[PDB]
Design a protein around this ligand. Structure first.
Ligand code: ZN
Length: 273
């Protein structure tokens, strides 16, 4: 058995230079990111004014092409700017800056990884991103920055060449995952540490990735509770810090002796923001 502290030591001793992180919704709740599926919110209330059989319909093509305006409501809401990364995000920013981060697989679409300062090439956004868009009609690619004004103005972005709808590269139901997902073939075998923050590991094939790391490689789950493959097939080098994600992360930063540096990075970074 290893403890959180033992993992911290591997990092401190420089024995973990190729960390692979998987993270889910649990890291973005702190930043106040609303759940579109959860009642009681401002965003949930918004979508309720449209004719939708359930909230998940905004992620279905047939609905989109019937009426795109529901989706673009969620888009406006989640578009970069509205929200600020949290300590969880900057922690991953730190790992990058110490040359310790091999890759960061995320299932969020809120973009808070890009904002906290992590480079597209270190990221694999498994659910897609608002940081770019495709024309539905002619297949043309565009910077998210470009449909920005239309999305904040409640207008349906339209392609300049053919004037079709320009859609953020989010993944809808039935859609194949982004191309970058296939980086897992080379990232997981090569990982010396696997870190899993704030995800309940139900959605496949995301969950099954935790089974791609070598048995000699520790797997650390920081999360509300023990979940999926980590729960059903345990491994001897598995460590769980069960509890509040933010709390658990501050503990690791502590055990790593990164307190000072984290406190700082968080003040440059949200300063600017
Ligand atoms: Zn077009």
């Amino acid at each position: 058995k290893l403890s959180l502290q033992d993992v911290a030591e591997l990092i401190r001793a420089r024995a973990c230079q190729r960390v692979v992180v998987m993270v889910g919704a649990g890291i973005s709740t702190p930043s106040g990111i609303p759940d579109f599926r959860s009642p009681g919110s401002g965003l949930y209330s918004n979508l309720q004014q449209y004719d939708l059989p359930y909230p998940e319909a905004i992620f279905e093509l047939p609905f989109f092409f019937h009426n795109p305006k529901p989706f673009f409501t969620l888009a406006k809401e989640l578009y970069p700017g509205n929200y600020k990364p949290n300590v969880t995000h900057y922690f991953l920013r730190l790992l990058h800056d110490k040359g310790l981060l091999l890759r960061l697989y995320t299932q969020n679409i809120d973009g808070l990884e890009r904002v906290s300062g992590i480079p597209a090439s270190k990221l694999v956004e498994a659910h897609g991103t608002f940081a770019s868009a495709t024309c539905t009609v002619c297949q043309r690619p565009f910077p998210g920055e470009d449909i920005r004004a239309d999305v904040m103005a409640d207008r349906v972005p339209r392609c300049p060449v053919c004037t079709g709808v320009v859609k953020p590269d989010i993944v809808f139901f039935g859609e194949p995952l982004p191309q970058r997902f296939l980086l897992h073939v080379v990232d997981f075998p090569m990982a010396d540490l696997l870190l899993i923050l704030g995800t309940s590991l139900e959605v496949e094939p995301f969950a099954s990735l935790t089974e791609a790391v070598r048995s000699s490689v520790p797997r650390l789950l920081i999360n509300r509770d023990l979940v999926g493959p980590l729960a059903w097939h345990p491994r001897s080098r598995d460590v769980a810090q069960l509890g509040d994600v933010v709390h658990g992360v501050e503990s690791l930063v502590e055990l790593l002796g990164w307190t000072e540096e984290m406190r700082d990075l968080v003040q440059r970074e949200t300063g600017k923001l």
